[PDB]
Design an enzyme around this catalytic site. Sequence first.
Site, mmCIF file in Angstrom:
data_model
loop_
_atom_site.group_PDB
_atom_site.id
_atom_site.type_symbol
_atom_site.label_atom_id
_atom_site.label_comp_id
_atom_site.label_asym_id
_atom_site.label_seq_id
_atom_site.Cartn_x
_atom_site.Cartn_y
_atom_site.Cartn_z
ATOM 1 N N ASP A 275 -0.563 -4.230 -1.333
ATOM 2 C CA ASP A 275 -1.026 -3.496 -0.306
ATOM 3 C C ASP A 275 -2.428 -4.192 0.104
ATOM 4 O O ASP A 275 -3.092 -4.729 -0.535
ATOM 5 C CB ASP A 275 -1.518 -2.309 -0.617
ATOM 6 C CG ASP A 275 -0.760 -1.060 0.213
ATOM 7 O OD1 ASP A 275 -0.521 -1.570 1.630
ATOM 8 O OD2 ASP A 275 -0.049 -0.187 -0.291
ATOM 9 N N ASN B 284 -3.197 1.233 -3.752
ATOM 10 C CA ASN B 284 -3.992 2.410 -3.994
ATOM 11 C C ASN B 284 -3.500 3.773 -3.634
ATOM 12 O O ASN B 284 -4.413 4.696 -4.190
ATOM 13 C CB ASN B 284 -5.287 2.048 -3.164
ATOM 14 C CG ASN B 284 -5.161 2.228 -1.458
ATOM 15 O OD1 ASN B 284 -4.699 1.433 -1.073
ATOM 16 N ND2 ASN B 284 -5.664 3.375 -0.950
ATOM 17 N N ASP C 22 -4.752 -2.448 2.892
ATOM 18 C CA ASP C 22 -5.656 -1.583 3.048
ATOM 19 C C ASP C 22 -6.237 -0.815 2.159
ATOM 20 O O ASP C 22 -5.368 -0.106 1.680
ATOM 21 C CB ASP C 22 -5.177 -0.755 4.215
ATOM 22 C CG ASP C 22 -5.384 -1.646 5.560
ATOM 23 O OD1 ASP C 22 -6.430 -2.135 6.080
ATOM 24 O OD2 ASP C 22 -4.194 -1.822 6.387
#
Length: 180
Positions: A20, A131, A22
């Site tokens: 991922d 996240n 961002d």
Amino acid sequence: QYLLPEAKAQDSDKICVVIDLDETLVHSSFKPVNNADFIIPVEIDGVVHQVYVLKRPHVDEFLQRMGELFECVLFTASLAKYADPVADLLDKWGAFRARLFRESCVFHRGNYVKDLSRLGRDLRRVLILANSPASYVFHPDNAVPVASWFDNMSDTELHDLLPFFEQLSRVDDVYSVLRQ
Ligand SMILES: [Mg+2]
């Protein structure tokens, strides 16, 4: 058709890691940040806006080493027109063997899910670094959580995950370590 082509020769023995962008590797904003790492102009309905990008600390070391340990794949919920320019500047080493964007996610209950089943890789040898647990609701046993990152320059989560990755890179079945 699967989201990835067949692994190239130099990748097929390796574990696939879906990463991922961002708040995992970088953090991007429309609010001007002084001393940004990158600034990319993004066109939205004909108007160019500047996107201010900060790199998470240790991301260069992390990315460089992950691209050796693994077949790395950028799988972001964001849109190519922002994520491609960012990956071009970030990925100094060819670490990302493919890039998958918003269209490749499945929107499920308000969340953009990376559905590892459409990858075309044996699920015993796929990891996802993300996240948010929402990212991997279909594959919680494939996941390596990392805290969301915004601008904390004392963060060392990427540095401290490397030895765990170093270990996962070498097992035959990731479920034997993560448990399924
Ligand atoms: Mg993210």
